[PDB]
Structures are given as structure tokens and as C-alpha cells.
Amino acid sequence: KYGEKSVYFDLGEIDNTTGNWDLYGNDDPNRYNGFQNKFFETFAGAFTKRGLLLKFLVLGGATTIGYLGSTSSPDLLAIKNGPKQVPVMGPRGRK
Amino acid sequence: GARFSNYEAWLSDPTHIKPSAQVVWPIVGQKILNGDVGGGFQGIQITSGFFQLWRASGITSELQLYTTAIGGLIFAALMLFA
Amino acid sequence: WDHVFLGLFWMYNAISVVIFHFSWKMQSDVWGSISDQGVVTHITGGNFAQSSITINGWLRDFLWAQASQVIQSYGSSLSAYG
Amino acid sequence: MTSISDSQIIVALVSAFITGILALRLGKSLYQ
Amino acid sequence: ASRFPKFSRGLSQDPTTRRIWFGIATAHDFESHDDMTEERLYQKIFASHFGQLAIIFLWTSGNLFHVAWQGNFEAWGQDPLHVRPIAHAIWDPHFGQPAVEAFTRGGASGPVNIAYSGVYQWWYTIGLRTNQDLYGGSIFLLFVSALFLIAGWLHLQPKWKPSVSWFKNAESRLNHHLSGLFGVSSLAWTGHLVHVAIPESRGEHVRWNNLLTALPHPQGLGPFFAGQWNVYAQNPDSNSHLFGTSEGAGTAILTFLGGFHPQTQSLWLTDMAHHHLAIAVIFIIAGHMYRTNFGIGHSMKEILEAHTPPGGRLGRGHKGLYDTINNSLHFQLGLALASLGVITSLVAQHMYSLPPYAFLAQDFTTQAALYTHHQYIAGFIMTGAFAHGAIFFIRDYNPEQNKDNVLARMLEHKEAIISHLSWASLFLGFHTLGLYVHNDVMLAFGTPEKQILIEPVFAQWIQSAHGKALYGFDVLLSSADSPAFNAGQTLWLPGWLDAINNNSNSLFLTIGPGDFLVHHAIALGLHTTTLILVKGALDARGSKLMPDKKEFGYSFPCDGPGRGGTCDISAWDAFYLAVFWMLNTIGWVTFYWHWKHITLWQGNVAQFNESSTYLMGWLRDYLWLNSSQLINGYNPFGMNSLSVWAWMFLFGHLVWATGFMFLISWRGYWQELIETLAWAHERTPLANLVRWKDKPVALSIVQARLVGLAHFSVGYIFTYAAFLIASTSGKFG
Amino acid sequence: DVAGLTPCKESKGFAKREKQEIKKLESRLKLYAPDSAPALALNATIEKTKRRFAFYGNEGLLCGTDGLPHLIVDGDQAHLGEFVYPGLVFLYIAGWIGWVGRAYLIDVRTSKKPTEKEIIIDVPLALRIMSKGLTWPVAAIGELRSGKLVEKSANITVS
Amino acid sequence: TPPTLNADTPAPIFGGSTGGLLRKAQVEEFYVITWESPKEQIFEMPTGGAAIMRSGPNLLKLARKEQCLALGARLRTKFKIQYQFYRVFPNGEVQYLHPKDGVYPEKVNAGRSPVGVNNRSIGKNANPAELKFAHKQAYDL
Amino acid sequence: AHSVKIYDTCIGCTQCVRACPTDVLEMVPWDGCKASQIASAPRTEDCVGCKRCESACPTDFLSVRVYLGAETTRSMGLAY
């Protein structure tokens, strides 16, 4: 898009020609407070690495799921509570 | 409905006589389809609601229905000619 | 043309669900027999509210229950329907 | 009258893990 | 090679989601991989077969372990007729308390599953008694699976890789396989029976610690080497014998009684011992037939060449077939699949009528499940045999080398074969459906005496020839003057006749007009499925509509809309069409078996004898009648133990319905819809931040057919399995 | 008798079924006037049922346990009317129709425009061919022996 | 013939649509079709809708070669208009494509060499079993 | 990456070239037919596989054949 006339094809401006624009992209550098950034970059910056994040996520999820499953109280889960009534006999007297 | 129905008997007793306007011939055991709809009549019970429409129109005899049928045939001939 | 061909199937689906809803709701909540003292007994006894919230409820209490008449109509005047 | 001991379950699980390692080796050989 | 389909370049370079689907779908077809040689093909197949063996043995070991750990095998053994076997325990976090109460069956302390595979009866019959036996078996099978995994890895190594000539040694492989794998295996099984399992049924306990000192017979091996083989059959078990105890127990190890054990209603163990011993001897003898390194024996190529009729009615005979079969893996696969399908159908037919396991034939649900399972397996196997035979015609067939032999002359009169099959199918269909509809009309009009009821006199005559004295034909074994009856009246015929004249078991059930009509419908299904499969196989190389189909492979969508339209033109599509007919035929067979046995077990055989002659009788008295407890598994008033089967029933109806969507609606609609979806995604704020890696496309035509058939078959199987299990377990009778 | 089947006249269950059907018809009859048309129709049905049962009993049909007639088709001389005679009649009629159709097709094949006669039937020629079909077995055997029934050079695909 | 170049010619009078270019044109090829009109006329856009072509040179960006060829076929058979189209790559490379030697493909022209021609009938192709464990396809022979 | 082959039974009626929606085919001078021209397929990289050329070919069996093969962003007919 040269834009001077009804011309919309221009090899000089190929990003305009192909319509490769940023619709809402905003590049103002000032968003947050300095001390907020200090705190968040100090604490949340540990999880930046991605392979370590994968390993930590998998190990933590496995540990949490196993601990909750194996230590859940009977008053919460019915499967751990177990049966409380007398069993019912089968049709032909088969138990 | 003028010739193969129990419309008059139904007119007498609307709440007990089942409407019926189709009668089958005795050929291969088809007799069993002629049910006991009431009014001393045997035939297939119909669900098209023509008896109710005719009663709302004020028709009380088979002669009026026969006249309407003849008029309908005349109108069919007129449409074909048109 | 093939889009119409598929729209026909989906129209069939929609209308089938609509007529099933009408039949069950009417039989369960409107139609019925009334006796002295104005007590109303419905054909299916008001089971639409509880049994229509599940697919199993439909399958058991509508198709299985209400098809007993069509599959037992042999030997009567309703045998043609079966 | 028997009910399977816990050490028997331990032995079964260890054997299953070894068999899984062997299966992993065979699958790696097939892939390559 | 670079991307996921490492074996395919064309699929690797595909920018769409079709790459993943087709990489999954073509992974195990080694002949199509890039740069594939014959040697690599054979070695990869051999290692894959080792892996399959390991998987099978792990499956068996898992069954054994889970039964030993969470099952009531010993309690069931104490009271076989009053205890329900336990398959595996349940740990579902999504349950509520009523379900936990409802699924606590057996003597368990929690929710469990009742087993319908019949492994309790099989394991009890072969001498297993406690949980330690099952645990030892599980550990041993783990070791065996590990051994096969090591074997596969080793025989893939460069030092230990076999050569192509080794894989094509047909005579030596058949000699070892026939001798060892059959005869020696059955001889070892006879050894197990005699040495361990027969003493177990008589109250003895023989294990590895006392195997070397517990004599199977009071005078062991004396008469065997003295020629007095009859000493081992002197004292069989009494008719009052109690299985597992010494009350009325004999000392014979190889009897030939014939019939059923009165208490367990199954075959005698000593009969089974002499059977497997005779089979072992026959197979070991039959092994020493083909020539190998020792200069004696037949040569299979020379046998095939010699057999050729003079006068040229068969042409060049079986000439050239040796190389055609040896060099084609698809020919071998088709032959193996056809044989295995026939054998599986034989197993299914001969196990319900001659139960071999103690306490079976009283567990009705197990019997029905086993029959249906192996019959569906057989149907799928037969369809696969025909499919891989069509693949042989397309890929491995060489017209010049098979010049005027039987194989080429089969392609020669293919139109005649297809025409006469079409005639047979049409004849059966017209006249069978006509009789059913005529009977329907007769009973609708209230005149059931006007229906055409035809007595199956040929099958009744055969039944009378076996010794059934109900039809009054008095022929062969039914005639006391027959030479056959006199010849057999001392060896096997007392017990066999007593079993066949009993009308409570399933040994040669009584038959009538309904049975006639159903065997005729089954014949219709068989001939029609054969029509479809044979038409696909023979017309695989080309037809009038498309004379060069062999250049387009086994599977391709179509040939375009030209020449009138060529949808479903390949042989793969004939497979696709025949799968539906296979499912329908097996459904008819299983429906017939299940209804007849339900009526037999309830004692009301008259309902089947009267209602099976018309189709409304089937629809009213089988399906609608027996679906009551199934559909009442869960209701607004609570839930039963049949809740899981009701849920599976609805699940199957749903999946079967979903398959119709892929079966009916084709691709272009979905492709355009996906195009609109892609436009929508590229133009949405906060969603443009995420980009797909593979361009989304609709499924392929063949892929759509396959997915529709898969959803269809899964729905079919799950629905019928749920209905069968629930309708047979709600009553247990 | 054959396969343990009793004759219909001797059998009980055949008579029970007849009694049940007559009783049902009379129960239906109880609702109408004696001289009305429904009564006459029901009486006609009753007489037809009686005649049918008498004919089935007297014709010599075997009867099952459930009380219904069964058919024997193995070739027995005492039951030829069940299968063999109607089979021969059907074979005659079907051979007639097939033979005359083939003859008409062959005669039309050599025409100015065979397809026009294929959709619009030449009624006189069709009637002549149809009337000549009485002796179709003799003509069929004649053309089978004369070598004018089958073809040898037909279109086939790539084998 | 010497293949033509590209320039800055006006586009047809179109009001916009949702059937235009997408990210594929940005990260892959897109196509441009050029033609000359004697008068302003209304024509149907291959992407849906109606546009007005200018008097003189015209230029139009399209996403597929099939769209360009369909529009050009309609122009030739309905307006008697000669047309060209090219292929444009993201880096700026331009490839001239349709009248490759200036003559439309349905007219025989000298200097063209056969490609893919087999000197036999379709029934003389070999058998797939003969070319087993080889990379040939029996129609490449 | 489909493959299009022309066989020597061609009569040079040019119908396939006119039917092609992506300009894959073209006519080439030839000897062996009355029209003295034959079809060629140089731009097979642009073939979509529609098989209109096969539908347009008058011959007992086709003189132009299309063998479907590896799929590409041009063969799949993708505008995105």
C-alpha cells in the first residue's frame, strides 16, 4: 500500500501490501511502579527457565495428587469411606 | 364421509362414538381392521378431525355432504378447463 | 443441493424432538380422566418433570413404556399400525 | 487360606519395572 | 524423514494436520516406508512378533495377579455354584455412597467387578487351588514376557540378525512348528493333566516339591513299556464322584468314557488327557514329512508341480504357486487369517455344546459372553483374511509367472463367480424376507394357522443320525440294528447317547421352523458378505469402469466425477462395505443363540417355538421384553448394580449414532466450515497471540470412512455387550 | 408321524385354536343387532373360519406341539401338494414369463431403433410372443441343444 | 517473449470483503493479476461481491492461483480482455506465470517441449509386482 | 506433488488444457495425430487434483492421467 492513489501494491512497502499491521499494539514503556517491578522480578523470576519449570510442574503435580489421594479423609471421599450397609444377595442365591 | 361413515350416530353421541369414514372390503382377512367404533358401524377410526369441522359448520345430514362432494367435483372440472 | 440434503436430516431431528416433547408433556400434565369431586388422573401420572431430565429417562419412560400398544396390536383392529 | 503378602507385591512391582525397562530397550531398537 | 513421520517424506513435508493422522495410520505398514529392503522388512516383522508375544503374556500375568490380589478364588472354589467370581476392585473417586454400597458384591470389603471371562472355572479345572498358585503363575508369566523382550532385542542385533534365506525355509520351519509347537506342546499338556490336574480333582495335592515322588498311577510306566496300555483305564471316576474330593474317585488316568461329568456337567478329565495325547502323537508323526538337511522327506514345490490334471480342465494346475506363496507375505497372512477365523468359529460352536470346564454351563452369563466374544473375533478375522488377499492381488501378484495356473484361471471366470453369488444372495433374500413378512401378516390378521411353517427335516435327520431319539427317524446311531451302533456300543456310545438324549443341556438342541428360518437368514448373510469380499478381491486389479486400478494402490478415494462418477471404487471400499454385512450377520447369529438359550434356561421353550416365526415376535419377546431390568439400572428412585450396564448401553447407542455423521456427510462442507473458522481465529483480539503450527483441514475421504466405521463398530459392540450382560445377569436364568 | 408331528384332525390345539377364534368372534358379535350388516359380516367371517379349519384338517397336514400346521419338503409322496406341486406350477409360470421376455428382446434387437421399442412396447409383436409361450420348455430345450441359447464372444474387462 | 515487469497501476473500485488476503500472503506467496479495460465495467470478484474495473490498467491481489485464473477466464470469455498474472514472494521476488511465452496454453506454439508424455497406450504400463522394492511407479517408465 | 502423464493415444483436441483450472497443461507441436499436436504437463507443481482434464478427454480410455501423491499447500487448495 503506497497509499497515494488507488494503488495498494508496492514492492517497496511489502508489509503494507500484505496487510501485516499491529492493530492494537502499544509501545509506551511506562506501565507499572519501580518497586513493584523490583519485587516481581526478584520473586517470580525463578520460574523463567522452561525446562526446570516443566520438571518442577510434573514433580509437584504428581506429589500433590498422590498426597491428596492417599491421605484424604473418609468423610470427604465416598470411595475411601467404603460400604456401610449389609450386602444384597444375588438372584439365584449367589453372593 | 357421506356414504361410508357414522357421522349421524356420532352427531347423536359425540363423546362415545369414535369417528370412522373408511371401510375395507372382505378379501384376505382384512375384516379385522373394521373396528367397533360405535353407532352400529364398523370401520377404520379416523383422526383428520373432519367430523368436528362438519359439526362446527352446521351439517346434520348426509345429503348436505353429498351435495358438497358433487360441487367439489364440478369445481375440479372447472379448474381443469381453466 | 447437498446443503439442502443435510438440512433435511437436521430438520427431521428437530421436528422429531418437538413432537416427542409435545406428546410426553400433554400425556403427562394435561390429558387425563376426571371423576367426581374434581380429582384429575393423568395418562402417565405426571412423570415428565422427573423422568425427562435424563436420556435414560426418555428411553425408558417414553419409548419403552409407550410403545407397548403398537407392539401388542396384533390380532386386533390396530394391527395395521404394528 | 492365603491372601498375598506385601513383600510379594514389592517383588511383583520390581519385576514389572525391570520388564518395562526391557520393553523400552526393545522399542528403542525397533525405532532405530 | 525430518519430521514426525520419519518413515515417509511426503507425509513429513505436509503442512496440515493430515500429517499426524496419516503418520499414525501408516506406521505399521513396512512395505511402504522409504528405502525399505526385503531383509529389513523381515527382521522388523520378526521383532514386532516378539513384541506381540510379550504383550500377550503380560496381559495374562496381569489377569492372574489382579485375581490373586483382589478376587475370592478360594471362597469360590469352596462353593462354586453359590459364589460370584471377582474380576478386579474399583477405585473411582467420582462415585457417591449409594454406588459404593451397590457395587459391594461377593465377600468383598469394597466395590468390585464380577468376572464374566470364565477364568475361575478354567484355572480351577487345571489344578490351581489357592492364591499362591496364581501369584506364582503371574511372576512366571512376567519372566516369560521379559524373556521374549530380550529375545526380540537380541535377534535384532547385527551379530544375531537372521538372513532372508532363513525366513524362506518353508520345509524346515513347518517341520519344527508342526512337530514341536503342536505335538510336543500337547504332549507336555497331557503330562501336566495326568501328573497334576487329575490328582487335584480326586483330592490329591501335587506340586513342584512332591512331583518326583507322587505316582500318577499305582503301577507307573510298567504297563506302558509292557504293552499293557489298557491298565491305565481300569477304574474311572464314578457317576457319584464329587469334583475336588476323593468320594467315588477312581484311579484311571486315560479313560474314553465320553459324555459329561454328572456333578460339573463338563467333559471328563481323562477323556481330555487321551485326546491331547492322541493329538500329540499325530502331530509329532506328521512333523516328519518335509525334506531337510537329512536327505529324506517330501518337497513341497514338487508336490505342487506334480498335481496337475491331464486334459487341461484345470489348466496348468498348481504350477508356479510355490514361489507365489513363498515370496508373498500377504498370501500367507490371508491363508493364516482364513484358517484362524474358521478355527475361532469352531471353538465358539463346540464350547457352548461341549463345555470343558467344571462349573461352566451353570454360569449362564459367562457362557453367553464367551460365545459372543469369540464369534465376533472370528467375523473380524474372516473379513481381514479377504482384505489381505485383495492386497495380495494388487501388490504381489505377477501375471506372467502365474500363467494359466489355478490362480489366473480364478481371475478368468470372475464374472461367473460374482453372477452366481449374486443369484444365490438374491434368491435367499427374496424368499426368506417374503416368508417372514407373510407370517407377520398372518398373525396381524389374527389367523396364525395360515403361516408357512417349514420343518427343518434335514437337520433333524442328521440329529437322529447322531442318536437323538426324539424325531422318530431311527437311522444310524438311532437304530439298534445299524453297524455303527453295534461297533460303538461299548467304547463311547453309552455316555454320548445319555448326553444327547438329555434335553436340559445344549448338546444338539431341539429345532423347529424358527430355527430353519434363522439358519436361512444366516446363510443369506454369509453368501452376501462373501459376495462383497470376493467382488472386492477379484475386481481389485481393474474393471470396465477403471481398467488400471492396480496403478493406484489398494486404498484411494475415487477417480473423480468423470465417466459417471467413481465413488467407493477401490477394493478397500469393498472391505469397508463388507464390514457392515459382517456385523449384521454376527448380530443375527448372536441374537438367535441368546434368545434360544434364554428360553431354554427359563424352561419356557414354547415362547421361542411360537414367537420366532415372525419378526414382531422377535421385536416384542426378545428385545423389548429383556431390556426392562437393563433400562431400570438407574431411575429417579435410586440405582442398582446394573447402573454401569445401563450407562454403557446408552453410551453404545450414542457412539453408534455418532458414526453416522462421518458416514453420511462428506468433506467439502467441513472444509469450507473450517475455512470460516480460520478466518474467525485470525481476526480475534487476544487470540491472535496464539498461532497454530499445522494448518487445520478437514479429514480425508478414506480417513472419514475409516473413522465412521470405527465409531459404528465400537457402538455396535458396546451396546450388544451391555444388553447381553445385563439381560443375562439380572435373572441368572 | 414325520419328525414326531401329529395330523391336524387328530391333534388337540388345532381344535383349541379353532374354538378360541370362534369364541372371540362371537364375543365381538354380542354387541350388534341380529339383522344388521355388522352381524352378517361377522357371521360370514365365522363360517369362513369354520370352512378353513375343516379343509386344513381334511387335507392331511401335520401339526406341531403348538397346534399349527407344519410343511414337509423333503420329497415325501404324502406331502407333494405342500411344496412340489406349487413349485412345478411356479417354475412353469416363471419360465413362461422369462422365455417370452427373452424372445421379445431378441426380436427387437434387430430393428431401426431398438431403444425406442425398449421403452415403447410394440403391442402386437409383444402379444404374439406372449401367446407363443405355452410350450416354453420344448423351445428352451430345442435352443439349448441347437446351440443358439448361449454366447461365446462377450465383452470382459482386463483379467 | 520478454516477460513483463510490475508497476504502480490502480486497483479496481471495491468496497472490501472478508474473502481477501490472510496471514498466508504475509508469510508465503500471493498472486497479482493485471489487465487493461477500455471502459469501466462491473464484474464479480472471485472472492465474492461486485467490483468496478477502471479504464486502463488494473491490478488485483489474490490469495490463490485458481482465483486469478478463474477471474482471467471470465474476463477473456465475457469482456474480451487480455490479462497477465504473477507470483509474489515475501522477500520481494516476483515470478511471471500465466502467459509463460506470451501465447495462451490452448494454442500450439513453437519452442515448447513435451513434459510427461509417455509413448505408449495407458494399457501398456507395467505391473506393481515387477517393480517391487524399487522406487519407480510404473507410470514414470 | 501430483503427477500428470500424457499417453500417445492423444488426438490433440485441446479440451484438457481448456478445462484445467490452474494452467498445468499446454499444447506442444507433435507428429502422430491429424491435428499434429499433443498435450504436455510442465507445471505439475500447481496441480490440485480436480481431474477435470480426465473428464474432458474423449478417448476409449484416457490419454491424460492424474496420479495423486504428496500433498502440499498448493495441492490442498488452501487460501490461508
Ligand code: CLA
Ligand atoms: C521346535 C521348535 C520351534 C518352536 C517351538 C517354534 C515356536 C514358534 N515360532 Mg518358530 N521357527 C522354528 C522352530 C520353532 N518355532 C524354526 C526351525 C524356524 C526357522 C526355519 C522358525 C522360524 C520362525 C519365524 C520366522 C517365526 C517363528 C515364530 C514362532 C512363534 C509363533 C507364535 C506363537 O507363539 O504361536 C503359538 C501357537 C500355538 C501355541 C499353536 C496352538 C494351536 C492352535 C492355534 C490353538 C490350539 C490350542 C487350544 C485349542 C487352545 C487352548 C488355549 C487355552 C486358553 C485353553 C512360536 C513361539 C513367529 C514369531 O512369533 O516369532 C517370535 C515368527 O515370526 N518361527
Ligand code: CLA
Ligand atoms: C446423534 C449423533 C450425533 C452427534 C452427537 C453429533 C454431533 C455434532 N454434529 Mg452431527 N451429524 C450426525 C450425528 C451426530 N452429530 C449425523 C447422523 C449427521 C448426518 C445428517 C450429522 C450432520 C452434521 C452436520 C451437517 C453438522 C453437524 C454438527 C454437529 C456438531 C453440533 C455443534 C456442536 O458442537 O455440538 C455441541 C455438542 C456436542 C458435541 C455433544 C455434547 C458434548 C458431549 C456430551 C461430550 C462433551 C464432553 C466430553 C466428555 C469431553 C471429554 C473428552 C475426554 C474424556 C477425552 C456436533 C459436533 C454441525 C457442526 O459442525 O457444528 C457447528 C454441522 O454443521 N452434524
Ligand code: CLA
Ligand atoms: C427378459 C427378462 C429377463 C431374463 C430372462 C433374465 C435372466 C436372468 N437374470 Mg435378470 N433382470 C431383468 C430381466 C431378465 N433377466 C431385469 C428387468 C432386471 C432389473 C431388475 C434384472 C436384474 C437381474 C439381477 C440383479 C440379477 C439377474 C440375474 C439373472 C439370471 C438368473 C435369473 C434371475 O436371478 O432372475 C432375477 C430376475 C429379476 C431380479 C427380475 C425379473 C424381471 C422380470 C423378468 C420382468 C422383466 C422383463 C420384462 C419387463 C418382461 C416383459 C417382456 C414383454 C415385452 C414380452 C438370468 C440370466 C442374476 C444373475 O446374474 O444370475 C446369474 C442377478 O443377480 N437379473
Ligand SMILES: CC1=C(/C=C/C(C)=C/C=C/C(C)=C/C=C/C=C(C)/C=C/C=C(C)/C=C/C2=C(C)CCCC2(C)C)C(C)(C)CCC1
Ligand atoms: C356494505 C356495502 C356493500 C358491500 C357489499 C359486499 C362487499 C358484499 C359481498 C358479498 C359476498 C362476498 C358474498 C359471497 C358469497 C359466497 C358464497 C356463498 C360461497 C359459498 C361457498 C360454498 C358453498 C362452498 C362449498 C364447497 C366446499 C365447502 C368444499 C369444496 C367444494 C365446494 C366449493 C362446493 C355495497 C357495495 C353493496 C354497497 C352498500 C354497502
Ligand SMILES: CC1=C(/C=C/C(C)=C/C=C/C(C)=C/C=C/C=C(C)/C=C/C=C(C)/C=C/C2=C(C)CCCC2(C)C)C(C)(C)CCC1
Ligand atoms: C481372495 C484371496 C485369498 C483369500 C481367500 C479366502 C479368504 C478363502 C476362504 C475360504 C474358506 C473360509 C473356506 C472354508 C472351507 C471349509 C471347508 C471346505 C470345510 C469342509 C469340511 C468337511 C468336508 C467336513 C467333513 C466331515 C463332516 C461333514 C462330518 C465329520 C466328518 C468329516 C470331517 C469328514 C488368498 C489369501 C487365498 C490369496 C488369494 C486371493
Ligand SMILES: CC1=C(C/C=C(\C)CCC[C@H](C)CCC[C@H](C)CCCC(C)C)C(=O)c2ccccc2C1=O
Ligand atoms: C465431522 C466431520 C469432519 C470434521 C471433524 C474433524 C476435523 C475431527 C476433529 C476431531 C478433534 C480434533 C477431536 C478428536 C477427539 C477424539 C476423541 C480423539 C482423536 C484420536 C486420538 C488418537 C488423538 C470432517 O472433517 C469430515 C471429512 C470428511 C467426511 C466427513 C467429515 C465429518 O463428518
